[PDB]
Structure formats: structure tokens, C-alpha cells
Amino acid sequence: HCLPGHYTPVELKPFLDRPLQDPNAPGASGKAFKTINLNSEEQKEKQAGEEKHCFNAFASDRISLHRDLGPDTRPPECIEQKFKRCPPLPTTSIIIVFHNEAWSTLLRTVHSVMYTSPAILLKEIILVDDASVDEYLHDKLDEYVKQFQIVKVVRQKERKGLITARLLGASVATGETLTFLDAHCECFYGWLEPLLARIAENPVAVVSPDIASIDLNTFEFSKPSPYGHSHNRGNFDWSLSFGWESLPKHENKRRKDETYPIRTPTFAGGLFSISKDYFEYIGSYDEEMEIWGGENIEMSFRVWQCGGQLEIMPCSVVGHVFRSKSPHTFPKGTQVITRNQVRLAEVWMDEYKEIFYRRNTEAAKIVKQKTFGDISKRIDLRQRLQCKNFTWYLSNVYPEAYVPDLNPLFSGYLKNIGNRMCLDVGENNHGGKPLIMYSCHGLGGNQYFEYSAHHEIRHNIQKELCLHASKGPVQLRECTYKGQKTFAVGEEQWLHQKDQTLYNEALHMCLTGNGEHPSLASCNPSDPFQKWIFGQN
Amino acid sequence: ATGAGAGAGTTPGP
Ligand SMILES: O=c1ccn([C@@H]2O[C@H](COP(=O)(O)OP(=O)(O)O)[C@@H](O)[C@H]2O)c(=O)[nH]1
Ligand SMILES: *[C@@H]1O[C@H](CO)[C@@H](O)[C@H](O)[C@H]1NC(C)=O
Ligand SMILES: *[C@H]1O[C@H](CO)[C@H](O)[C@H](O)[C@H]1NC(C)=O
Ligand SMILES: [Mn+2]
């Protein structure tokens, strides 16, 4: 089965040949489509699309299903890379899960895969319908897709969400590998070979493309740059949200060219390839997780702790329509996401789970009322595979991570006697911006604060941020205290006094909850707006 | 009263 040499370009020719495109058509070569100067019926269609899909479906419906993405702008070593015939490139089953996807976006995903994926690799495309309502996604889709011969639609009759749908897809797949894609993606040139070649080399590797943004408003594709730019890897924050960060210096040094894998603490988890056998062996997904949320983080910890590796291959580029809001209904509310996170925290995070429970009150409650369900199959899997503990994961996989204290001196919320609202970090804050007052919700999150031995008031979900005194509005800034060497600057040291005032040690002034932004004022023990409760949840 | 970071239920872009 194992031949000498490298696959030829003829051996790699795609399943379907892209027709030469009209260069002046809308969205051509992946450039912006500006949908402006619309008549009254058109402006109606656009708002209907935006509100159905939480992307500009009006734009998507006017762009070819066949659009090229212009010239291949990947690094030169990616365009030149050859693939050995031994071990052979494995076959793949493409699994696209959808729930009420637009036609234009679902079929541009399917067309993209056929135009960019070598015929010799592409065994089948499985479309998993998670109980879509739209009639066009029933018989119309079944019939349209027959022409392609290798495309099958599988139906999840009752809405069970993305996790159950992927397990359904996997159970019918016969490929040697599974490649998962969302239903609003577009494959770049040569995206598949580098994923599948890496699994051929190392079958415990779970590999992701370097995911590109497709703009939800204009459908512009963010193209790779040829000169070794800043890459992102996946992380988690201590609310267990997926996030992106710069690579550390040791990884830049280790990677000699762009064909080298990037080791990633977490993966976005929509777009990746895996050995089918390894997917099953390493515990596929927790079947009790519902709708959306947590499974990518759960899979990240489980792969790493149980002896696999999570990798991003920058020679593999796939565009994704990133949204700001879900279009999806939640049959039994968004509590589902928090239950999914408690399930992964109980199984994988050991003592570190308490750091998350403190920051998401809803999760602390689910633990206390034991409504997160039976995890005995997940516990059993962690034992049978002899997976390492979370201390090992933080040390060996994510040594760069800020880890809060397991048992901080104090955590909770800051409630103002005067106006009966809570100190809130606001919608968007990672440096610089003033804070707000917001209704006390007791949920933690944006109202979460810790008190340190060194008199700091921390907001430490993502970064180690410290309440930072100023002549005007109070800020969150990076703590200057970060262990052995360093100290705590007076602008970040506070005393909660007997009169319930918050007294900054540097400025000798008191936090008031008056105005839009809490600021420092002359200390007035009779001012209710300078009186703070440090409430525990 | 937002129940999470604004409009969660989506993966953030890079
Ligand atoms: O209940 C659901 C929710 C989502 N999806 C699909 O799961 C994939 C991931 O969801 P989405 O794209 O909304 O999440 P994000 O990519 O924003 O994390 C998409 O192809 C959705 O159509 C699904 O099948 N059932
Ligand atoms: C976790 O594993 C590490 C070494 O990988 C070990 O030193 C430590 O004792 C273990 N922690 C627990 C909580 O068992
Ligand atoms: C939701 O966002 C608002 C701002 O719109 C507040 O920051 C609020 O605290 C947020 N909720 C949570 C749970 O963080
Ligand atoms: Mn998506």
C-alpha cells in the first residue's frame, strides 16, 4: 500500500473543477460586497436575512456558490509543500452539521469542499440536519445534492444540537479520517492535504486549519499573508470561554517554517480533522452535552490529558462566517451551556474547577443542586486511558496561562448603598476604559472581584487586571504585583473601611458610585454613594 | 440584565 515519492499535482486534482469566474461579479476573488443604494423591497429582504441568520444573507445570496478566492497568498513553503505516498494520505469523510442554515452559505460550503479537496481524499460529504424548520433544507436539498454522488443528508428528527449531530455524522462515516466543518465556511487552496498528512504522520494529532474570518456584513474573505505573520492559538479563560492569543517565543523558535504544526492549548472545535479510530478511542464527545457550548474546551483538555496533541496547521486555511449573536433558539434556555461547562470541569479540571465555579454563579448552583447529570462514563474513560491531571496540563500544555488562586482571600461583588447597583467592568474592557454601575445580578462574570493579601481588588477572568485609582474615573489595568520579584503600587491598593468606604492608598480618596463612571472623590463617610458592600454570592 | 459576556453562543473571530 505504501509507495515511494510524492503525490503529483495530477494525483491531487480536485473532486470538481472550478469554472473560470467573472472577475466583476459580486464577492469575486473573495473581495468585499458592499450592499448599498437598496430599493425598499431590497432593504426589507436584507433586514429579514440579518434577523434570520445574524449575517448579511442578502450579500451571500448574490455571491456565486463557485467564487474563487483570488491568488494563493499562503507562505511559499505551503504552496511548494509535497506529500509522501508513504504513509499514504488517508481518505476523509466531511461532516457538516447545520440547523436552519441559509441555502447560499450551506451550498457554497459544499461547493468549496468539492473544488479544493483532491478526489483521491474525498470519500464522502455528510450533511447532518439538526431538525431544521426551513422547507428548502428538506426534499429540495436531498435532490440537489444527488448530482455530486458522494453527498448524503442524515436527519436528526428532534432538535438535539451540534454534539449529537456530529456523533450521528461520525457513526455513518466510513472514511479513515473525519473532517468537521460548519455550514458557513469556504476552503482555501490546498487546505486538506496538510491536515490529513499530519494525521498520517501522527495519528494522535487532532488538527485544525488556521481559521480565516469571512466578514458577516460584506462576505470579504481575510486572506493568508505570505510572510510569516502573527499566528493565533486557542486558549480558555476562567469563565471557560474559548479565546485566541499570540504564540509564545519558544513556539516561534521551535517552528522553522510554516509547514510545522502550532501546538495549541485549545481549538475552536468546529473545523478540524481526526483519525476516525482515534476519535472513538479518545472518547468522541460527552453525549449528554446539549445544543452548543463547552465541547471544544472539553475535547481540548481530554485530547491533551489523555496522550494526544491539538495542532493548528497554517498551510491549511478555511474561512468561517464569525457571528456576534447566535440565530439559534435554545429549547430549554442558555443554562444548557453552563451545564455542559460544569460537566467538563467535574471530569477534567480537578481542584482548578473551583476557579470557574467562583466566577460563574450559575455553575456553582448547578454543582450545589447536582443537576449536571451522571458523568460516570467520562470518569471511567479518564481512568481507563490513564489521562494526566489538570496540574500536568497547565505545566506541560499551557505554562503561559495566568492561574488565579484556588482559595482567594475573598471573592464576590461590590454593591453601592447609595444607588443599590454593582460595580461592573462593562460590555468591552481589557485595558484603559472606565467601568460602569449595573443592576446587581449575582451571576459573577462582569461583576466578579477578588481582594488580595496586598490590598488589590482583582477582576481576573482573562488577564490579572487590578482596580487602578486615578484623579477621575477608576480603571482596570494589569496588576503590577505578579509574585516574587514585584510589589503592589498604591494606585492598585484599597482599604474597605469601617464606614464601608473604598479608600485608595496612593491618592487618599474614596470610590464613589455617582455619575456614569465610578471615580475617586474626597472621602465623605456620610455619602451613601461612597458606601460599598463586598457581597459574597 | 445580560446573563453572560454580551451575545455568547458564538465563537469569537481572531
Ligand atoms: O443546535 C444547533 C446549533 C448549531 N448547529 C450547527 O453547528 C455549527 C456550529 O454552530 P454556530 O456556527 O452557530 O456556532 P459558532 O460557529 O458561532 O461557534 C453550525 O454549522 C450550526 O449550523 C446545529 O446543528 N445545531
Ligand atoms: C498531578 O500530576 C503531577 C505530575 O504530572 C503530580 O506531580 C501531582 O502530584 C498530581 N496532582 C494531583 C492533584 O494528583
Ligand atoms: C452583561 O453585560 C452587561 C453590560 O451590557 C454587564 O457587563 C453585565 O454585568 C454582564 N453580565 C455578566 C453576567 O457578565
Ligand atoms: Mn459557525
Coordinates of C-alpha atoms and ligand atoms in Angstrom, one line a residue:
Chain A
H1 CA 0.0 0.0 0.0
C2 CA 3.0 2.4 0.7
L3 CA 4.5 3.9 -2.4
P4 CA 7.8 5.8 -2.8
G5 CA 7.9 9.5 -3.7
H6 CA 5.4 12.4 -3.6
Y7 CA 1.8 12.8 -4.9
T8 CA 1.8 14.6 -8.3
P9 CA -0.5 17.6 -9.0
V10 CA -2.5 15.3 -11.3
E11 CA -2.9 12.8 -8.4
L12 CA -4.2 15.7 -6.3
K13 CA -6.7 17.2 -8.8
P14 CA -9.9 18.2 -7.0
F15 CA -13.3 16.3 -7.0
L16 CA -14.9 19.1 -9.1
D17 CA -13.1 21.7 -11.4
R18 CA -13.9 25.3 -10.6
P19 CA -15.1 27.2 -13.7
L20 CA -13.1 30.4 -14.5
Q21 CA -15.2 33.1 -12.8
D22 CA -16.4 36.6 -13.9
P23 CA -13.9 38.9 -12.1
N24 CA -16.6 41.8 -11.9
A25 CA -19.3 39.6 -10.3
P26 CA -20.3 40.3 -6.6
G27 CA -17.8 38.9 -4.0
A28 CA -15.5 37.8 -6.8
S29 CA -12.0 36.7 -5.7
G30 CA -13.2 37.0 -2.1
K31 CA -13.4 40.8 -2.1
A32 CA -15.9 42.9 -0.1
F33 CA -19.6 43.0 -1.5
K34 CA -21.0 46.4 -0.3
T35 CA -24.8 46.1 -0.4
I36 CA -25.8 49.9 -0.5
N37 CA -28.3 52.1 -2.5
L38 CA -31.0 49.4 -2.0
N39 CA -34.7 49.8 -3.1
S40 CA -37.4 49.5 -0.4
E41 CA -38.1 45.7 -1.1
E42 CA -34.3 45.0 -1.1
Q43 CA -33.8 46.8 2.3
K44 CA -36.8 44.6 3.6
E45 CA -35.1 41.4 2.3
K46 CA -31.7 42.4 3.9
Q47 CA -33.3 43.0 7.4
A48 CA -35.2 39.7 7.1
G49 CA -31.8 38.0 6.3
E50 CA -29.8 39.7 9.1
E51 CA -32.6 38.7 11.6
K52 CA -32.9 35.1 10.3
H53 CA -29.1 34.4 10.1
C54 CA -27.2 37.1 12.1
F55 CA -25.2 37.7 8.9
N56 CA -25.9 39.6 5.7
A57 CA -27.7 36.8 3.8
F58 CA -28.7 39.5 1.2
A59 CA -24.9 39.6 0.3
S60 CA -24.4 35.8 0.5
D61 CA -27.5 35.2 -1.8
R62 CA -25.9 37.5 -4.6
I63 CA -22.3 35.9 -4.5
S64 CA -21.5 32.8 -6.7
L65 CA -21.5 29.4 -4.9
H66 CA -18.4 29.0 -7.1
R67 CA -16.4 32.2 -6.3
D68 CA -12.5 31.8 -6.4
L69 CA -10.6 33.5 -3.5
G70 CA -8.1 35.2 -5.9
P71 CA -4.4 34.2 -5.9
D72 CA -2.9 31.8 -3.3
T73 CA -1.3 34.2 -0.8
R74 CA -0.1 31.5 1.7
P75 CA 3.6 31.3 2.6
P76 CA 5.8 29.9 -0.2
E77 CA 6.8 26.7 1.7
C78 CA 2.9 26.0 2.0
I79 CA 2.5 26.4 -1.9
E80 CA 5.6 24.2 -2.6
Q81 CA 4.9 21.5 0.1
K82 CA 4.9 17.9 -1.4
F83 CA 3.2 14.9 0.3
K84 CA 4.8 11.5 0.6
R85 CA 2.9 8.4 -0.7
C86 CA 4.1 6.5 2.4
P87 CA 2.4 6.7 4.8
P88 CA -0.4 7.3 2.2
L89 CA -2.7 10.3 2.5
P90 CA -5.8 8.9 4.4
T91 CA -9.3 9.3 2.9
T92 CA -11.7 11.6 4.8
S93 CA -15.4 11.9 5.5
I94 CA -16.5 15.6 5.6
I95 CA -19.2 16.2 8.3
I96 CA -21.2 19.5 8.0
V97 CA -23.8 19.9 10.8
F98 CA -26.5 22.5 10.2
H99 CA -29.6 24.0 11.9
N100 CA -31.6 26.5 9.7
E101 CA -28.5 27.4 7.6
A102 CA -29.1 29.7 4.6
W103 CA -29.1 27.8 1.2
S104 CA -26.4 30.1 -0.4
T105 CA -23.9 29.5 2.6
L106 CA -24.6 25.8 3.1
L107 CA -24.2 25.1 -0.7
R108 CA -21.1 27.4 -1.0
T109 CA -19.5 25.3 1.8
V110 CA -20.3 22.1 -0.1
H111 CA -19.1 23.6 -3.4
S112 CA -15.9 24.9 -1.7
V113 CA -15.0 21.4 -0.4
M114 CA -15.5 19.8 -3.9
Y115 CA -13.4 22.4 -5.8
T116 CA -10.5 22.4 -3.3
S117 CA -10.3 18.8 -2.0
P118 CA -8.3 16.2 -4.0
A119 CA -10.7 13.5 -5.4
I120 CA -8.4 10.7 -4.0
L121 CA -9.0 12.0 -0.4
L122 CA -12.7 12.9 -0.6
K123 CA -14.7 9.7 0.1
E124 CA -18.0 11.5 1.1
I125 CA -19.6 14.7 2.4
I126 CA -22.2 14.0 5.2
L127 CA -24.7 16.9 5.8
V128 CA -26.3 16.4 9.3
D129 CA -29.6 18.3 9.6
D130 CA -30.2 19.1 13.3
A131 CA -34.1 19.3 12.9
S132 CA -34.2 22.4 10.5
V133 CA -37.6 24.0 10.0
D134 CA -36.9 25.6 6.6
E135 CA -38.6 23.6 3.8
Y136 CA -35.8 24.2 1.2
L137 CA -33.5 22.2 3.5
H138 CA -35.8 19.0 3.2
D139 CA -36.6 17.5 -0.2
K140 CA -35.0 20.4 -2.2
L141 CA -31.6 19.7 -0.6
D142 CA -32.0 15.8 -0.8
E143 CA -32.5 16.1 -4.6
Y144 CA -30.0 18.9 -5.5
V145 CA -27.1 17.0 -3.7
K146 CA -27.6 13.7 -5.6
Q147 CA -25.7 15.1 -8.7
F148 CA -22.5 15.1 -6.6
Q149 CA -22.8 11.3 -5.9
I150 CA -20.8 11.3 -2.6
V151 CA -23.1 13.8 -0.7
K152 CA -25.6 12.3 1.8
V153 CA -28.1 14.2 4.1
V154 CA -28.7 12.5 7.5
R155 CA -31.7 13.7 9.6
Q156 CA -31.7 14.4 13.4
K157 CA -35.6 14.5 13.6
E158 CA -35.7 16.1 17.1
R159 CA -33.5 19.1 17.9
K160 CA -30.6 17.8 20.0
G161 CA -27.8 20.3 18.9
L162 CA -24.3 20.2 17.4
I163 CA -22.8 17.5 19.6
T164 CA -25.4 14.8 18.9
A165 CA -25.4 15.7 15.2
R166 CA -21.6 15.2 14.9
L167 CA -21.8 11.8 16.7
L168 CA -24.6 10.9 14.1
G169 CA -22.3 12.0 11.2
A170 CA -19.4 10.0 12.7
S171 CA -21.5 6.9 13.1
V172 CA -22.4 6.8 9.4
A173 CA -18.9 8.0 8.1
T174 CA -16.6 5.2 6.6
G175 CA -13.6 7.5 5.9
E176 CA -10.3 6.8 7.7
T177 CA -10.5 10.4 9.0
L178 CA -13.4 12.7 9.9
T179 CA -13.2 16.4 8.9
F180 CA -15.8 18.6 10.6
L181 CA -16.7 22.0 9.0
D182 CA -19.6 24.5 10.0
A183 CA -22.2 25.2 7.2
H184 CA -20.9 28.7 6.5
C185 CA -17.2 28.0 5.5
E186 CA -15.1 28.4 2.4
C187 CA -12.0 26.3 1.9
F188 CA -8.7 27.9 0.7
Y189 CA -6.4 26.2 -1.9
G190 CA -4.5 23.1 -0.6
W191 CA -6.4 23.2 2.8
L192 CA -6.9 19.4 3.1
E193 CA -3.5 17.7 2.4
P194 CA -1.6 19.3 5.3
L195 CA -4.3 18.2 7.9
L196 CA -4.5 14.6 6.5
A197 CA -0.7 14.3 6.0
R198 CA -0.2 15.3 9.7
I199 CA -2.6 12.6 10.9
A200 CA -0.9 10.1 8.5
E201 CA 2.5 11.1 10.3
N202 CA 1.0 11.1 13.9
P203 CA -2.5 9.6 14.4
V204 CA -2.9 11.0 18.0
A205 CA -2.8 14.5 16.3
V206 CA -6.1 16.4 16.2
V207 CA -5.5 19.0 13.5
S208 CA -7.2 22.3 12.7
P209 CA -6.8 24.8 9.9
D210 CA -5.6 28.4 10.6
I211 CA -9.3 29.6 10.5
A212 CA -9.8 32.8 8.4
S213 CA -12.6 35.3 9.0
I214 CA -15.3 35.8 6.4
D215 CA -16.9 39.1 7.2
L216 CA -20.6 38.7 8.3
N217 CA -21.5 42.1 6.6
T218 CA -19.6 42.1 3.3
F219 CA -18.5 38.4 2.9
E220 CA -14.9 39.6 2.4
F221 CA -12.5 36.6 3.0
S222 CA -9.4 37.5 5.2
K223 CA -6.6 36.0 3.0
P224 CA -3.5 34.5 4.5
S225 CA -0.3 36.6 4.1
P226 CA 2.9 35.0 2.6
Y227 CA 5.4 36.5 5.1
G228 CA 5.4 34.7 8.5
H229 CA 2.8 37.0 10.2
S230 CA 1.5 36.8 13.8
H231 CA -0.5 33.5 14.2
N232 CA -3.1 32.9 16.9
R233 CA -3.5 29.7 19.0
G234 CA -6.6 28.7 21.1
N235 CA -6.9 29.3 24.8
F236 CA -9.6 29.3 27.5
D237 CA -10.4 32.0 30.1
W238 CA -11.6 31.2 33.7
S239 CA -15.3 31.5 32.6
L240 CA -14.3 28.6 30.3
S241 CA -14.8 30.8 27.1
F242 CA -12.7 29.8 24.0
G243 CA -10.3 32.6 23.0
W244 CA -7.3 33.5 20.7
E245 CA -3.8 34.5 21.7
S246 CA -0.4 35.2 20.1
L247 CA 2.1 32.3 20.0
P248 CA 4.8 32.3 22.8
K249 CA 8.5 32.9 21.9
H250 CA 9.6 29.2 22.5
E251 CA 7.0 28.1 19.8
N252 CA 8.2 30.7 17.2
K253 CA 11.8 29.4 17.8
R254 CA 10.6 25.7 17.5
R255 CA 8.7 26.3 14.2
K256 CA 11.4 26.5 11.4
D257 CA 8.9 27.1 8.6
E258 CA 5.0 27.4 8.2
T259 CA 4.6 23.7 7.3
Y260 CA 5.4 23.0 11.1
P261 CA 2.4 22.4 13.3
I262 CA 1.5 25.1 16.0
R263 CA 0.8 23.3 19.4
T264 CA -2.5 24.9 20.7
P265 CA -3.8 24.7 24.3
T266 CA -7.4 24.6 23.0
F267 CA -9.1 24.5 19.4
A268 CA -12.2 26.4 18.1
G269 CA -13.5 22.8 17.5
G270 CA -15.9 23.5 14.6
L271 CA -13.3 23.0 11.8
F272 CA -10.8 20.1 12.3
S273 CA -9.7 16.6 11.2
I274 CA -9.1 13.5 13.3
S275 CA -8.4 9.8 12.8
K276 CA -11.9 8.1 12.9
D277 CA -10.4 5.3 15.1
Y278 CA -8.7 7.9 17.4
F279 CA -11.9 10.0 17.6
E280 CA -13.7 6.8 19.0
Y281 CA -10.7 5.7 21.2
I282 CA -10.2 9.1 22.9
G283 CA -14.0 9.3 23.9
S284 CA -15.7 11.0 20.9
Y285 CA -17.9 13.7 22.7
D286 CA -19.8 13.7 26.0
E287 CA -23.2 12.6 24.5
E288 CA -25.0 14.4 27.5
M289 CA -23.9 17.9 26.3
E290 CA -26.8 19.8 24.6
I291 CA -27.3 22.4 21.7
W292 CA -23.9 24.2 21.8
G293 CA -21.0 25.2 24.1
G294 CA -18.2 23.6 26.1
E295 CA -17.5 20.6 23.8
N296 CA -14.4 22.2 22.1
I297 CA -12.9 23.0 25.6
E298 CA -13.9 19.6 26.9
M299 CA -12.3 17.9 23.8
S300 CA -9.1 20.2 24.2
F301 CA -8.4 19.0 27.8
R302 CA -9.3 15.3 27.1
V303 CA -7.0 15.1 24.0
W304 CA -4.0 16.7 25.8
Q305 CA -4.5 15.0 29.2
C306 CA -5.1 11.5 27.5
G307 CA -1.9 11.5 25.4
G308 CA -2.9 13.2 22.1
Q309 CA -1.9 16.6 20.7
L310 CA -4.0 19.6 19.5
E311 CA -2.3 21.3 16.4
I312 CA -3.1 24.2 14.0
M313 CA -1.6 23.8 10.5
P314 CA -1.1 27.3 9.0
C315 CA -0.7 25.8 5.4
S316 CA -4.4 24.8 5.9
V317 CA -6.7 27.8 5.6
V318 CA -10.6 27.7 5.9
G319 CA -12.8 30.8 6.1
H320 CA -15.6 30.9 8.6
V321 CA -18.6 33.4 9.0
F322 CA -17.9 34.5 12.6
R323 CA -21.1 36.0 14.2
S324 CA -21.6 38.3 17.2
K325 CA -25.1 36.7 18.1
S326 CA -26.5 33.2 17.7
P327 CA -29.5 32.9 15.4
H328 CA -30.4 29.6 17.3
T329 CA -33.3 29.0 19.7
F330 CA -32.4 27.2 22.9
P331 CA -35.3 24.6 23.6
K332 CA -34.7 24.8 27.4
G333 CA -32.7 28.1 27.8
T334 CA -29.0 29.1 27.7
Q335 CA -28.4 27.3 31.2
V336 CA -27.5 24.3 28.8
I337 CA -24.1 26.0 28.0
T338 CA -23.3 26.3 31.8
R339 CA -24.3 22.6 32.5
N340 CA -22.0 21.5 29.6
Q341 CA -19.1 23.5 31.2
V342 CA -19.8 22.0 34.7
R343 CA -19.7 18.5 33.1
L344 CA -16.2 19.2 31.6
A345 CA -15.0 21.0 34.8
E346 CA -16.1 17.9 37.0
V347 CA -14.3 15.4 34.7
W348 CA -11.0 17.2 33.7
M349 CA -10.2 20.2 35.8
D350 CA -9.5 18.6 39.3
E351 CA -9.2 21.4 42.0
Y352 CA -9.0 24.2 39.3
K353 CA -12.8 23.7 38.7
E354 CA -13.4 25.9 41.8
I355 CA -11.8 28.9 40.0
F356 CA -14.6 28.7 37.4
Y357 CA -17.4 28.0 40.0
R358 CA -16.5 31.2 41.8
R359 CA -16.8 33.3 38.5
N360 CA -20.0 31.7 37.1
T361 CA -22.6 31.6 40.0
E362 CA -25.0 29.6 37.7
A363 CA -22.3 26.9 37.5
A364 CA -21.7 26.9 41.4
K365 CA -25.5 26.4 41.8
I366 CA -25.7 23.5 39.2
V367 CA -22.9 21.9 41.2
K368 CA -24.7 22.5 44.6
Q369 CA -28.1 21.2 43.3
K370 CA -26.3 18.3 41.4
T371 CA -28.3 19.0 38.2
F372 CA -25.2 18.4 35.8
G373 CA -26.1 14.7 35.4
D374 CA -24.2 11.4 35.5
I375 CA -20.5 11.7 34.3
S376 CA -19.5 8.1 35.3
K377 CA -18.8 7.1 31.6
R378 CA -16.5 10.2 31.3
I379 CA -14.8 9.5 34.7
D380 CA -14.3 5.8 33.6
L381 CA -12.7 6.9 30.2
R382 CA -10.2 9.3 32.1
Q383 CA -9.3 6.3 34.3
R384 CA -9.1 3.6 31.5
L385 CA -6.9 5.9 29.3
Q386 CA -4.7 6.9 32.4
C387 CA -5.1 10.6 31.5
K388 CA -2.8 13.1 33.3
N389 CA -4.3 15.7 35.7
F390 CA -5.0 19.4 35.1
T391 CA -1.8 20.4 37.0
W392 CA 0.1 18.5 34.3
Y393 CA -2.0 20.2 31.5
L394 CA -1.3 23.7 32.9
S395 CA 2.5 22.9 33.3
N396 CA 3.2 21.0 30.0
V397 CA 0.5 22.4 27.6
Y398 CA -0.3 26.0 28.8
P399 CA 2.6 27.2 31.1
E400 CA 1.9 30.8 29.9
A401 CA -1.6 30.8 31.4
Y402 CA -2.4 33.2 34.3
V403 CA -3.9 30.8 37.0
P404 CA -5.9 32.6 39.8
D405 CA -5.6 31.4 43.4
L406 CA -7.5 28.1 44.2
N407 CA -8.7 29.8 47.5
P408 CA -8.6 33.6 47.2
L409 CA -8.9 35.7 50.5
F410 CA -12.3 37.0 49.2
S411 CA -14.5 36.9 46.0
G412 CA -17.9 38.4 45.2
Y413 CA -19.5 41.7 44.0
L414 CA -19.2 45.4 45.1
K415 CA -22.7 46.8 45.7
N416 CA -23.2 50.6 46.3
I417 CA -25.5 51.6 49.3
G418 CA -26.4 54.9 47.6
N419 CA -27.8 53.7 44.2
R420 CA -28.2 49.9 45.1
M421 CA -26.2 48.9 41.9
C422 CA -23.0 46.8 41.4
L423 CA -19.5 47.9 40.1
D424 CA -19.5 46.4 36.5
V425 CA -16.5 46.2 34.1
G426 CA -18.9 46.9 31.2
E427 CA -19.6 45.4 27.7
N428 CA -15.9 45.8 26.5
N429 CA -12.8 46.2 28.7
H430 CA -9.2 44.5 28.5
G431 CA -7.2 47.8 29.4
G432 CA -7.9 51.6 29.7
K433 CA -11.8 52.2 29.6
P434 CA -13.8 53.5 32.6
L435 CA -16.2 51.0 34.5
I436 CA -20.0 51.3 34.9
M437 CA -22.7 50.7 37.6
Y438 CA -25.2 48.0 36.5
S439 CA -28.1 46.1 38.3
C440 CA -26.6 43.5 40.7
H441 CA -27.4 40.1 39.0
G442 CA -25.4 37.9 41.4
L443 CA -24.1 35.9 38.3
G444 CA -20.4 36.8 38.8
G445 CA -18.8 37.5 35.3
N446 CA -18.6 41.3 34.7
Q447 CA -19.4 41.9 38.5
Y448 CA -16.7 39.4 39.7
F449 CA -13.9 40.9 42.1
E450 CA -11.3 39.4 44.4
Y451 CA -9.5 41.0 47.4
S452 CA -5.7 40.1 47.6
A453 CA -3.3 39.9 50.6
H454 CA -1.6 43.0 49.1
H455 CA -4.9 45.1 49.2
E456 CA -5.7 44.6 45.4
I457 CA -9.3 44.4 44.0
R458 CA -8.8 42.0 41.1
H459 CA -11.0 41.3 38.0
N460 CA -9.2 38.1 37.0
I461 CA -11.3 36.1 34.4
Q462 CA -9.0 36.7 31.3
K463 CA -5.9 38.7 32.5
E464 CA -4.7 39.6 36.0
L465 CA -6.4 43.1 36.0
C466 CA -6.4 45.4 39.1
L467 CA -8.8 48.3 40.1
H468 CA -6.4 51.2 39.4
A469 CA -7.0 54.6 41.1
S470 CA -6.9 57.9 39.0
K471 CA -7.8 61.6 39.7
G472 CA -11.0 61.0 37.5
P473 CA -12.7 57.6 36.6
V474 CA -11.3 54.3 38.2
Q475 CA -9.8 51.9 35.6
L476 CA -8.9 48.2 35.3
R477 CA -5.2 47.9 34.5
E478 CA -2.7 45.0 34.6
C479 CA -1.7 44.2 38.2
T480 CA 1.9 45.4 38.9
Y481 CA 2.1 42.6 41.6
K482 CA 2.7 39.2 39.8
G483 CA 4.6 37.2 42.5
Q484 CA 8.2 37.1 44.0
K485 CA 10.2 40.0 42.3
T486 CA 7.4 42.7 42.1
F487 CA 5.3 44.7 44.6
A488 CA 1.8 46.4 44.7
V489 CA 1.6 50.1 43.5
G490 CA -0.6 52.4 45.7
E491 CA -3.0 53.2 42.8
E492 CA -4.0 49.4 43.0
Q493 CA -4.2 49.2 46.9
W494 CA -7.6 49.7 48.6
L495 CA -8.8 49.6 52.2
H496 CA -12.5 48.7 52.8
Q497 CA -13.0 50.8 55.9
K498 CA -15.5 50.6 58.9
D499 CA -17.8 53.2 57.2
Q500 CA -17.9 50.9 54.1
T501 CA -15.8 53.4 52.0
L502 CA -13.2 52.1 49.4
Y503 CA -10.1 54.2 50.2
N504 CA -7.2 54.2 47.6
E505 CA -3.8 54.1 49.5
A506 CA -1.9 56.3 46.9
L507 CA -4.5 59.1 46.3
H508 CA -6.0 59.1 49.9
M509 CA -9.5 59.4 48.2
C510 CA -12.7 57.2 48.1
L511 CA -14.5 55.4 45.2
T512 CA -18.0 56.9 44.5
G513 CA -20.7 55.2 42.5
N514 CA -22.2 58.5 41.4
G515 CA -22.1 59.5 37.6
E516 CA -21.9 57.1 34.6
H517 CA -18.4 56.0 35.7
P518 CA -17.2 55.4 39.3
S519 CA -14.5 57.9 40.1
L520 CA -12.3 59.0 43.1
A521 CA -13.7 61.8 45.4
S522 CA -12.8 63.4 48.7
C523 CA -13.7 60.7 51.4
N524 CA -17.2 61.5 52.9
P525 CA -18.4 58.9 55.4
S526 CA -22.0 60.3 55.2
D527 CA -22.2 59.9 51.4
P528 CA -24.2 56.8 50.6
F529 CA -22.6 56.7 47.1
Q530 CA -19.1 56.1 48.8
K531 CA -20.6 53.1 50.8
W532 CA -19.8 49.7 49.3
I533 CA -21.0 46.2 50.3
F534 CA -18.4 43.5 49.4
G535 CA -21.1 40.7 49.0
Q536 CA -20.3 37.0 48.5
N537 CA -22.5 35.0 46.1
Chain B
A1 CA -29.6 42.0 32.7
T2 CA -27.2 40.3 30.3
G3 CA -26.7 36.6 31.5
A4 CA -23.1 36.4 30.0
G5 CA -20.5 38.3 28.0
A6 CA -23.0 40.2 25.7
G7 CA -24.0 37.7 23.0
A8 CA -22.3 34.4 23.9
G9 CA -23.4 31.3 22.0
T10 CA -20.8 32.2 19.2
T11 CA -17.1 31.6 18.8
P12 CA -15.1 34.9 18.6
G13 CA -13.1 35.6 15.5
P14 CA -9.2 36.0 15.7
Ligands
LIG1 O1 -28.5 23.4 17.7 C1 -27.6 23.6 16.8 C2 -26.8 24.7 16.8 C3 -25.8 24.8 15.8 N1 -25.7 23.8 14.9 C4 -24.7 23.9 13.8 O2 -23.4 23.8 14.5 C5 -22.4 24.5 13.8 C6 -21.8 25.5 14.8 O3 -22.7 26.5 15.3 P1 -22.5 28.1 15.1 O4 -21.9 28.2 13.7 O5 -23.8 28.8 15.4 O6 -21.6 28.4 16.3 P2 -20.2 29.3 16.2 O7 -19.5 28.8 14.9 O8 -20.7 30.7 16.1 O9 -19.4 28.8 17.4 C7 -23.1 25.3 12.6 O10 -22.9 24.7 11.3 C8 -24.6 25.2 13.0 O11 -25.5 25.3 11.9 C9 -26.6 22.7 15.0 O12 -26.5 21.8 14.1 N2 -27.5 22.6 15.9
LIG2 C1 -0.8 15.6 39.1 O1 0.3 15.1 38.3 C2 1.6 15.7 38.7 C3 2.7 15.3 37.8 O2 2.3 15.3 36.4 C4 1.9 15.3 40.1 O3 3.1 15.9 40.5 C5 0.8 15.7 41.1 O4 1.0 15.2 42.3 C6 -0.6 15.3 40.6 N1 -1.6 16.1 41.2 C7 -2.6 15.5 41.8 C8 -3.6 16.5 42.4 O5 -2.7 14.3 42.0
LIG3 C1 -23.8 41.6 30.7 O1 -23.3 42.8 30.1 C2 -23.7 44.0 30.9 C3 -23.3 45.2 30.0 O2 -24.2 45.3 28.9 C4 -22.9 43.9 32.2 O3 -21.5 44.0 32.0 C5 -23.3 42.7 32.9 O4 -22.6 42.5 34.2 C6 -23.0 41.5 32.0 N1 -23.3 40.2 32.6 C7 -22.4 39.3 33.1 C8 -23.0 38.1 33.7 O5 -21.3 39.4 33.0
MN4 MN -20.1 28.9 12.9

